[PDB]
RNA sequence: AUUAGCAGUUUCGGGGGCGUAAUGCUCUCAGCUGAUUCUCAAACUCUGAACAUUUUUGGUAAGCAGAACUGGCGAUGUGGGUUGAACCAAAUAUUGGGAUAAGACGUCUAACAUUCACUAAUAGAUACCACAAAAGGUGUUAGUUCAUUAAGACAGCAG
RNA sequence: CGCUAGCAGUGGAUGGUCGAUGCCCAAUCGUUAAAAGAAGUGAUAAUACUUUUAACAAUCCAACUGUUUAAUUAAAACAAAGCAUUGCGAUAAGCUUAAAAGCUUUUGACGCAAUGUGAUUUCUGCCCAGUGCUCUGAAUGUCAAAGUGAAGAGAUUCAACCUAGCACGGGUAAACGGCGGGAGUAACUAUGACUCUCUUAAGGUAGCCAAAUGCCUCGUCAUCUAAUUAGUGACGCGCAUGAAUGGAUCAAUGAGAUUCCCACUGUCCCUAACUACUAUACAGCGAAACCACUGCAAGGGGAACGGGCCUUGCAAAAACAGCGGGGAAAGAAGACCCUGUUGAGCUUGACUCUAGUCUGAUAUU
RNA sequence: GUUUCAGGUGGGGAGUUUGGCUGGGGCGGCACAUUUGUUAAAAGAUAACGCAAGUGUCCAAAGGCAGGCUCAGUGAGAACAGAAAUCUCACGUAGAGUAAAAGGGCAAAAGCCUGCUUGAUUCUGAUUUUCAGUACUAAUCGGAACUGGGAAACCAGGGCCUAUCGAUCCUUUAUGUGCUUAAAUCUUAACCCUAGAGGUGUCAGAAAAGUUACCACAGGGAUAACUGGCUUGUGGCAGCCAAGCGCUCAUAGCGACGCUGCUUUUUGAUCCUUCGAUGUCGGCUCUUCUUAUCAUUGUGAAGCAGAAUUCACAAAGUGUUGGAUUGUUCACCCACUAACAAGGAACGUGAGCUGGGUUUAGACCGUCGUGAGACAGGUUAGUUUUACCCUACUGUUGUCAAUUGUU
RNA sequence: ACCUGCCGCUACCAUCCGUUGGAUAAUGGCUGAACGCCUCUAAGUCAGAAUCCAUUCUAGAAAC
């Protein structure tokens, strides 16, 4: 009986368990959990204090200690530190929540910051200001996430900010030739869906078109022009800050 | 070893591990400098050398001996300048300490932190010094002796224990005292060696020998 | 295993200053060599030592764990250490007297005097043993070295 | 206890005294060793004996009725209608039985037997590599006995021939089950349709979600609250969701699980009063478990938390009614945990066997 | 169909096993038979899950023998020759190599090269090593056959030495054609006899998989889960040092690298105490104590003008809150307050409560498992017994059950 | 059953009541040396805590 003499009890850990699953086999390690993270970021500050133990488990929350057969074959190697070492790189890491936390804050930086590159232009010395961007998004609401990267929530959210109201980024010009039979045609299909600038037929000196797009939306443009006439003579890609030769669109 | 405390390691016991084919997981040496002020400086211009000995038998930490060099190398400055201290501390650490870590416990434990497999893995480089045993050294002019007790006073803090600062009866880094130094100028026999002395003495390694004398004269 | 400068090199390494630049010299710095210097290297060694105490491995340690030599305790007690399995003396048939051991000697509690210092502290009071350290004190005691002093010192006050 | 300006503290100096089961001496008894005999037994006639000498409003779940673990689980468990699969046309299927024999069978697929799921509603994606099943498969590699051929003088040996099952080849997933890993990939896309590649056959479709399924985790956002590790609604590379191992929905239903609001205010801060009844006093009537001994403390050391030991504090007959700090209280040779070459109940692709069954064979013939 | 044998299928059922070491037991490891150096304390013997390493083999040559030679390395030279190929010469006590570990050994060799060879053969007696003065392994020493090598001297029991390995039983080989097979006898077959082989690595040698939270027995504080004890790496607090900050200015306030403590309010380590049973976690209740003092009393510093704050002494005398959420101390918010300081009392406080966790059975999921089942995962429901004994406390009588006057 | 309900108990669901002296710690000074000056200290002394001990209150001894 319990009760009586020692009714028992059950202990809960804190530490970091990095967890990698090699050949269906699950090993993990004893890490702390502000240590684990600050590894990747370049701090070396000795494997030896990252590391709680310098020991492998099947799991490490109970406490099970990892086999040598189990180990050689599915790391090609029994010797055990350089096994923690691959596990504390590759494995999935536990956090903490005020590490998780910080994670979370980057990247909400990083979505305005995207957002920044490319504003709205007046002239070409008008916001590009990553702060207003920021503040918008704090003061609408959306759920920041881990899995989704930066750009792709870029693009998502700035369609809701859209109807707060708030105008945003600008657009650039990529730049193509065409030839003189489809190019053509082409023109006949994408005048009224988008804005086509720069359009000049001619039937010697081929035809040159300039797509409009801000870079994150260039799949679009170039789908119908691949349905229809394939890859032109010529495909001029810019970068996504700047449109070589100053913005001045939006 | 800034991880513990040093109280784990100020009494020297068990026999002493090193650096080698058996000990390879060691970490570096905190010092591995032994180079403080001017090293091109000549052995007949310093005629002062003081001295810091550890008053206990005791291990000294690698880390103790790096606080304590800066200490007579921030000193150096205020005090005097480059063109008085010399020093090659005159104790190293070979010697190791090992750490069976049970750190690992923080809330349960595996059971390997018990005392299987207890035998601890490498963690602190350390020194072994007994009483007489000398821990600073700074060969120097003779315009400078408060001016460099201070610094060793300094350094004494930073040591484990009781420790005793002097000053020698000699040249320093040399065998020979002030009175039979003077010997050397005026009996010819004095050779420079650009901070050491070598001393000319008649000898016989050969079979019949004359360059003995006029070898280094 | 590893610290330092030194010298002798530079058709071998590198960069400067000296005729444009080098390795032609001279430099700091590479390499090699020569003489000296720092720490000597459980698995190095030319040489070579005579439960508790002593030795000693793990271990931060542990009234932890693991060995060696001797001693005990345990299967012997008594006196002594207040008390106490192991420390001290010392071993027990049963007694008498004498003298001791360790330990004591204001009182508890058998046992004292004489003498010199030191301490003035809510102290300080016998191994094992019931903890104390680095570091401070113009506390008092005891010393040691150099300096000054009747060419008049020291502190004081006055110019 | 107390001590202090010599101290009864510390460090000495010169004597001196107390004091062990130790030592000395003496005595007494035993033991030993040696020796002696009329044992103070000088009329006895003893030696198996004596003597001497010496030494020692909301969410979840379940459809609902119902049922269940009599002395701890009434539920979300079980069941169930519905949905699905399987086997079987009688000398069947399933079954019991040593045998004889019998049941389901007063039965005949509109059934009986065996599953699995669990009403409705809407849906049930891919996989046959495995493991099981299934075979009317190619027919042959293996393949026992009897039977057969040879050798040998025979015992015997050696050979061919070869069934079932195994192996091989197909069927099978509302059978057990799974529904990746590494490269790029629908502006890097959120995700992964895709293309390469490996593993084993495939690589999570519809849906669903921090769910009774989310380690991290108190995830991120919104809401509800002055404030919420709670609730609900969103998000979803989901440590480890997912389609009869059933997925999603849900009216009614619920001694089920959770949240909030309203009725609730002694289940309100803060307790109060009142009555019954017991208790409490009497009168009769009378009991057990338990009980080494025993009951005052502080500290010390000691199987390391003493009532006893030690040193201190102290101490006052006999008792009453309450109280629950202590008696490392009591009830129970802890079943938690380990051990013992101790068991059991169950499981399986342990070892060994076996009922029964499938085929082969002789005899029956 | 029956029979009787045969093969298959056959956890439906039966009977059994599921090693040991172990700083609890698992998980991990093998310290289970063995070899090297150190541990190992100048004979020897000596442990730990002590350290750095090795073994389950290989070699007709990597054996045996004679002779002949010298190796590592360096230097200076030389069409082709690349710095570095090959070929000279000097210097080279060994730094090379010797199947493999490390230690030793070693130069007219034990290395390398050549030749010839099969002593890597057989019988026998003694011994060594660990020792249980037993067994085995491996080795040594001679004696007799058979050889081999070299002129011979001599050497050759395989490997330069220390490791490289295995009982009865049974089977099988080799051998003298031995011995029996018990009425004589013959041919077989069979057994012996003698030496080998097959092998047991748990290595002086069981044929062996799980689970049990549906469980049970015998014992264990040799041994885990709570306390307490020692310990204090880890936690918490405190000192000393002063590089620097503090504009300037080391110490108003901080304080580096560095160094010494205390604490037992963290957690480990340990396994002394308890398994003839100390009822485990929290909350409520209630006292007590500690101070490492948050407030207040009184004081002193400040970068203290005032204001507010910060630092410190004495001091524990009095305070030390209301709530959401959480099983929860812990955690985190809202609100008050002079302040909402940290602790201790068997992780104070279960015959004081409650049972929200943790603690059995039933049961849902998810992951894991062929499965029975598992989970320091989540979820849900789950009987908290006894004071009428002693003491302690609270109050209530009564008494020096007369101290030697009543009242 | 309900209303009302004295007496009685009871409520921060009400009312009343909660003192003054010495002794100090820290600390701030005095006079004043050791140490011709100096210095709260040594000899000595002053002021001085929600502190201590009395006064107050409770109980009332194998005490009178």
Redesign the interface.
């Known amino acids: 009986m319990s009760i009586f003499t020692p009714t028992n009890q059950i202990?809960?850990?804190?530490?970091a368990v990095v967890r990698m699953k090699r050949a269906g086999k699950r090993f993990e390690i004893?890490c702390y959990k502000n240590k684990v993270v600050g590894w990747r970021s370049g701090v070396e500050k000795?494997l030896?204090e990252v590391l709680?133990?310098?020991?492998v488990?099947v799991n490490?929350s109970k406490?099970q200690?990892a086999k040598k057969e189990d180990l050689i074959s599915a790391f090609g190697t029994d010797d055990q530190t350089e096994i923690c070492k691959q596990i504390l790189t590759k494995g999935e890491v536990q956090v903490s929540d005020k590490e998780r936390h910080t994670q979370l804050e980057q990247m909400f930086r990083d979505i305005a910051t995207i957002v920044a590159d490319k504003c709205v232009n007046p002239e070409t010395k008008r916001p590009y200001t990553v702060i207003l961007i920021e503040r918008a998004m704090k003061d609408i609401h959306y759920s920041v996430k881990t899995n989704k990267s930066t750009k792709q929530q870029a693009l998502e959210v700035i369609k809701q900010l859209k109807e707060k109201m708030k105008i945003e980024r600008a657009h650039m010009r990529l730049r193509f030739i065409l030839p003189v039979n489809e190019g053509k045609k082409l023109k006949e299909k994408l005048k009224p869906l988008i804005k086509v600038i720069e359009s000049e037929d001619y039937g010697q000196q081929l035809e040159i078109v300039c797509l409009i797009d801000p870079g994150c939306f260039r799949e679009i443009d170039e789908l119908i022009k691949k349905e229809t006439k394939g890859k032109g003579s010529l495909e001029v890609l810019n970068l996504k800050d700047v449109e070589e030769g100053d913005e001045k669109f939006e | 070893m800034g991880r513990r405390p040093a109280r784990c390691y100020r009494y020297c016991k068990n026999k002493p591990y090193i650096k080698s084919r058996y000990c390879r997981g060691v970490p570096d040496a905190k010092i591995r400098i032994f180079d403080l002020g001017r090293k091109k400086a000549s052995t007949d211009e310093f005629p002062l050398c003081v001295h810091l000995i550890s008053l206990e038998k005791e291990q000294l930490s690698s880390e103790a001996i790096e606080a304590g060099r800066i200490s007579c190398n921030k000193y150096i400055s205020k005090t005097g300048g480059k063109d008085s201290f010399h020093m090659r501390v005159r104790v190293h650490p070979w010697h190791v300490l090992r750490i069976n870590k049970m750190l690992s416990c923080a809330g349960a434990d595996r059971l390997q932190t018990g005392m299987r497999g207890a035998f601890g893995k490498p963690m602190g480089t350390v020194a072994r010094v007994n009483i007489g045993q000398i821990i600073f050294s700074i060969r120097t002019r003779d315009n400078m002796l408060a001016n460099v007790v201070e610094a060793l006073r300094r350094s004494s803090y930073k040591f484990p224990g009781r420790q005793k600062i002097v000053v020698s009866k000699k040249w320093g880094f040399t065998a020979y005292n002030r009175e039979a130094y003077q010997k050397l100028k005026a009996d010819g026999r004095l050779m420079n060696d650009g901070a050491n002395v070598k001393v000319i003495t008649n000898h016989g390694t050969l079979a019949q020998y004359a360059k003995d004398i006029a070898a280094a004269n």
């Not at chain 1, 202990?11 to 530490?15: A, E, I």
């Open positions: 202990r809960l850990t804190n530490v004893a000795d030896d709680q133990t310098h020991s488990f490490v406490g200690v």
